[PDB]
Short mmCIF file of C-alpha atoms (C1' of nucleotides) in Angstrom, two decimals:
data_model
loop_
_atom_site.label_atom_id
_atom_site.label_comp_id
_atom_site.label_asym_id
_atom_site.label_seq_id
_atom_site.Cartn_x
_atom_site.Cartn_y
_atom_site.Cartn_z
CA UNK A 1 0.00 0.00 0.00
CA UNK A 2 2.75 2.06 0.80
CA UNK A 3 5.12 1.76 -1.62
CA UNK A 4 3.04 1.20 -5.00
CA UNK A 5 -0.77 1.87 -3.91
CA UNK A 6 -0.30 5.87 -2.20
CA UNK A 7 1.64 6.74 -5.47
CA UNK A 8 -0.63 5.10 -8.27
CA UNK A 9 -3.64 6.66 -6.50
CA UNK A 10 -1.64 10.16 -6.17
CA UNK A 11 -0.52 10.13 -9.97
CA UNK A 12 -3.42 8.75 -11.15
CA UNK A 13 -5.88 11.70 -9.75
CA UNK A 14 -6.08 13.76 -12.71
CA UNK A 15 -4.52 17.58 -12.75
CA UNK A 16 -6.37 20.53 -11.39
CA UNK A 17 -7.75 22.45 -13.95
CA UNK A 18 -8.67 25.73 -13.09
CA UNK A 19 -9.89 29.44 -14.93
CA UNK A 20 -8.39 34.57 -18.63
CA UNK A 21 -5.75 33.00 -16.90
CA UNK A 22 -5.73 29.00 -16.49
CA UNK A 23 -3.68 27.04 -13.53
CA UNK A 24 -2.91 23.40 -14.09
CA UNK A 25 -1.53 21.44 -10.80
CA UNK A 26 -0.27 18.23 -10.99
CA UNK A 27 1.21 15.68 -8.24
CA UNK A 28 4.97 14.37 -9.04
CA UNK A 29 5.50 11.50 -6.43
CA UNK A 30 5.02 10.81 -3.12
CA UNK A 31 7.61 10.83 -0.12
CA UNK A 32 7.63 8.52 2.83
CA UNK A 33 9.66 9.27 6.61
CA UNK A 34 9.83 7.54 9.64
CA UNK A 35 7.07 8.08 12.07
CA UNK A 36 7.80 11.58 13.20
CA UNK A 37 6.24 13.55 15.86
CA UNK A 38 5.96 17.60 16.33
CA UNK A 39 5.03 18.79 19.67
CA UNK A 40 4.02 22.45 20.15
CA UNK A 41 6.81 23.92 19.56
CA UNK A 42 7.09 21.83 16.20
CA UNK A 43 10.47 20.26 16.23
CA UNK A 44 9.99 17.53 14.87
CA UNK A 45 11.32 13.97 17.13
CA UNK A 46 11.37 9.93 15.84
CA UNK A 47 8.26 9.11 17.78
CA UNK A 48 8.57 5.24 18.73
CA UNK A 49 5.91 3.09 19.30
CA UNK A 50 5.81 2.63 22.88
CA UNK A 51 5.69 6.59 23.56
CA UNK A 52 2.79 6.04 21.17
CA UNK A 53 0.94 3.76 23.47
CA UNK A 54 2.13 5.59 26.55
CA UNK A 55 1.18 9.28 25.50
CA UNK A 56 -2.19 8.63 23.82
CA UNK A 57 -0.32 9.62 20.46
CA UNK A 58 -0.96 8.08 16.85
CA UNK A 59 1.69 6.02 15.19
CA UNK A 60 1.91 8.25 11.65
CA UNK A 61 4.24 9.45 9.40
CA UNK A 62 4.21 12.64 7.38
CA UNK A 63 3.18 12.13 3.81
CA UNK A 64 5.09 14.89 1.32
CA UNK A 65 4.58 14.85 -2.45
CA UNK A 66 6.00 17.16 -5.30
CA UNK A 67 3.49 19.59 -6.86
CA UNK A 68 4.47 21.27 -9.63
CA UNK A 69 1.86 24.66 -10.27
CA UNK A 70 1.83 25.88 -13.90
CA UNK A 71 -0.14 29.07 -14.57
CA UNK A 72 -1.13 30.41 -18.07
CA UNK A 73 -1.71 34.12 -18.43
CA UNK A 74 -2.12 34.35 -21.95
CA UNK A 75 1.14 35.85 -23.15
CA UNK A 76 2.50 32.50 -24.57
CA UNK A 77 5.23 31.90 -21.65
CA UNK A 78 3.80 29.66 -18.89
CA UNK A 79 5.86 30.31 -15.80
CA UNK A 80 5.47 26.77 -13.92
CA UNK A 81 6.42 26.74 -10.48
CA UNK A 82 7.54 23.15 -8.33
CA UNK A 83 6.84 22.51 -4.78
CA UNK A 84 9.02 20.22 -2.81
CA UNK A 85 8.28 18.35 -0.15
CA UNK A 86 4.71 19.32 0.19
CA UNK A 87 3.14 18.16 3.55
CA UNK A 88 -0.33 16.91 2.72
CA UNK A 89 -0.67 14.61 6.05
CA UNK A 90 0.23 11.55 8.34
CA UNK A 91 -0.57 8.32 7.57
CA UNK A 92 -0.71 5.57 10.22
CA UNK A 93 2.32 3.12 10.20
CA UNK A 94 1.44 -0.14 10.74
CA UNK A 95 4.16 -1.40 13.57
CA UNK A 96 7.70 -3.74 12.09
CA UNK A 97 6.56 -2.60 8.70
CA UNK A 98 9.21 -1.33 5.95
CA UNK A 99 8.61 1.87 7.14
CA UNK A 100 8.45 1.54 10.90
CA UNK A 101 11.21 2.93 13.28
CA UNK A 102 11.01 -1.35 14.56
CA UNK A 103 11.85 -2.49 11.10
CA UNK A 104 14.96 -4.52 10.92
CA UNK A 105 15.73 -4.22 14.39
CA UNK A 106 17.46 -7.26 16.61
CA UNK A 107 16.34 -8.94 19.68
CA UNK A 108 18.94 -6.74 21.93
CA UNK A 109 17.71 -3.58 19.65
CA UNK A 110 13.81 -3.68 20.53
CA UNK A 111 14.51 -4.59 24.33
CA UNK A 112 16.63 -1.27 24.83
CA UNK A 113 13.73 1.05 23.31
CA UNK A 114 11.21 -1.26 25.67
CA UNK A 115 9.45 -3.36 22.70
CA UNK A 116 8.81 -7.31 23.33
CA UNK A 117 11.00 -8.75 20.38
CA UNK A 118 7.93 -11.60 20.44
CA UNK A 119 5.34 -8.66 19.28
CA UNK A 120 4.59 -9.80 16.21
CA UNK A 121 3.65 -6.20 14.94
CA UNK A 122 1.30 -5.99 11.69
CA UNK A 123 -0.79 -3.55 14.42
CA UNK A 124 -1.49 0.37 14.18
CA UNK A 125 -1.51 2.33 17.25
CA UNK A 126 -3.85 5.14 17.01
CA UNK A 127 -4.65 7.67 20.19
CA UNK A 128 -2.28 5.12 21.93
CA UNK A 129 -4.97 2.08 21.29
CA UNK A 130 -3.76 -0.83 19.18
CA UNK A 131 -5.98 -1.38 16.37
CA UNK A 132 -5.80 -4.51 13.88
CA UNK A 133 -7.29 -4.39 10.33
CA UNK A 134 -9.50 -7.47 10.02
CA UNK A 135 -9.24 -8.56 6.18
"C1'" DT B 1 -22.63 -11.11 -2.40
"C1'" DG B 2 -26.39 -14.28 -1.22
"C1'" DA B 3 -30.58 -13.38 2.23
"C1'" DA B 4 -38.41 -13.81 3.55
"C1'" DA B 5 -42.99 -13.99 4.34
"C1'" DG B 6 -47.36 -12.16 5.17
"C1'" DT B 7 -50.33 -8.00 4.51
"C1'" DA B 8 -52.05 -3.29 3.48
"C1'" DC B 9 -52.86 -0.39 -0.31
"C1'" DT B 10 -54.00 1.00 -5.72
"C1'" DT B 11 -56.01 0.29 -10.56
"C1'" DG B 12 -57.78 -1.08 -14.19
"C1'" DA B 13 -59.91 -3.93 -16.53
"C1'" DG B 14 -64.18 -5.75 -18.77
"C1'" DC B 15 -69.55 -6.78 -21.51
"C1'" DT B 16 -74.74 -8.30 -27.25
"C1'" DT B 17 -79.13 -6.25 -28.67
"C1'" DA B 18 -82.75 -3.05 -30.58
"C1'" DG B 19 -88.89 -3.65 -31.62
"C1'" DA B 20 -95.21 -5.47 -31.38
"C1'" DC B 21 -98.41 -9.57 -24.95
"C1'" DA B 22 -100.81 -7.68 -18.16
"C1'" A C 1 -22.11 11.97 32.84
"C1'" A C 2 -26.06 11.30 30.90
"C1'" A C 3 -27.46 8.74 25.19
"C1'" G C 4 -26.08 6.46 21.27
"C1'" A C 5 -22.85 3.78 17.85
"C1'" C C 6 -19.50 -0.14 17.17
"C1'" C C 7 -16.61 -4.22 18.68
"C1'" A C 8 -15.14 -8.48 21.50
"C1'" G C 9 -16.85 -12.11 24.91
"C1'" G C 10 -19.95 -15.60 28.66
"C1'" C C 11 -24.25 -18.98 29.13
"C1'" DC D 1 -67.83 -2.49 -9.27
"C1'" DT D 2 -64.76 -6.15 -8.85
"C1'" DC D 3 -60.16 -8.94 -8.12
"C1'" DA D 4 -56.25 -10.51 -9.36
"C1'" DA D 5 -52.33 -8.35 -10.35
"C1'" DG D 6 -49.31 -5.77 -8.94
"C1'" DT D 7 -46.70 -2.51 -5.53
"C1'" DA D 8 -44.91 -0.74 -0.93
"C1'" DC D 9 -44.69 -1.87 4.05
"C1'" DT D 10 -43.42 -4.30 8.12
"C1'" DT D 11 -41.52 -7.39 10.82
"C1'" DA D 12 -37.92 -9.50 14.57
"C1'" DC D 13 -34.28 -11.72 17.87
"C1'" DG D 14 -33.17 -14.35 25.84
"C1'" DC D 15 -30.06 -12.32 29.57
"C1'" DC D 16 -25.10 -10.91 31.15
"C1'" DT D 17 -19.75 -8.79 30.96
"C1'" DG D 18 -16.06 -5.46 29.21
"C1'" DG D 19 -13.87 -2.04 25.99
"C1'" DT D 20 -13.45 2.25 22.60
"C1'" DC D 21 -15.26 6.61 20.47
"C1'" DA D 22 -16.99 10.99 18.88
"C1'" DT D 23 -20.06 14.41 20.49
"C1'" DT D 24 -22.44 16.75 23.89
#
DNA sequence: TGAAAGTACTTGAGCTTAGACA
RNA sequence: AAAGACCAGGC
DNA sequence: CTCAAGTACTTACGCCTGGTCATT
């Protein structure tokens, strides 16, 4: 879902198009981080999962993808301008995914950040309650 | 994605037939 | 803390 | 003035435990 679903269903939206001048918006591709959290002050912290549980928090990562904005104002030169990094929101890591902070780590590894190495993950933690998709 | 049985409403058909006896 | 929704479970 | 031929319309389901959740 991650890797090939969020970026077919963000390049497959079709462009905004808006009007005289004419603005034309289209999504590049989609960037993925480590679950991240930003307290009030908004620097932003790895958030792990058991602070998750703890603190009532949801187990997300920010979601950024390239927008490039083209405007047409008649005068035959369209001046197109690219975004970078473009926050759009946090998705909800399922836990020992590929992109989980838990993801590759050994026995020794998930005992010093307080995480059974049993847990068999496949979970999301949302408001610090541990929710399973039923299929 | 399957999947239920009885009852309260409407509506709309559908039809050989005329004289002069009490 | 009232009224709802959902879920899981016991007999 | 029917009546069979249709269409809406209505049903329900024993008790008990707990948890979460969004809104008020």
């Amino acid at each position: 879902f991650i890797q090939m679903s969020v970026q077919r269903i963000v390049e497959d939206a079709p462009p905004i198009d808006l009007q005289p001048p004419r603005y034309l918006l289209k999504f590049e591709q989609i960037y993925l981080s480590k679950p991240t959290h930003w307290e009030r002050d908004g620097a932003p912290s790895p958030m792990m999962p058991n602070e998750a549980r703890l603190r009532n928090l949801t187990y997300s990562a920010p979601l950024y993808v390239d927008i490039t904005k083209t405007v047409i104002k008649e005068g035959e030169e369209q001046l197109q301008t690219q975004h970078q990094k473009t926050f759009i929101g946090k998705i909800p890591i399922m836990l020992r995914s590929t992109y989980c902070l838990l993801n590759g780590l050994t026995d020794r590894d998930l005992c010093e950040l307080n995480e059974c190495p049993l847990d068999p993950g496949g979970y999301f933690i949302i408001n610090g309650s541990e929710k399973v998709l039923i299929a």
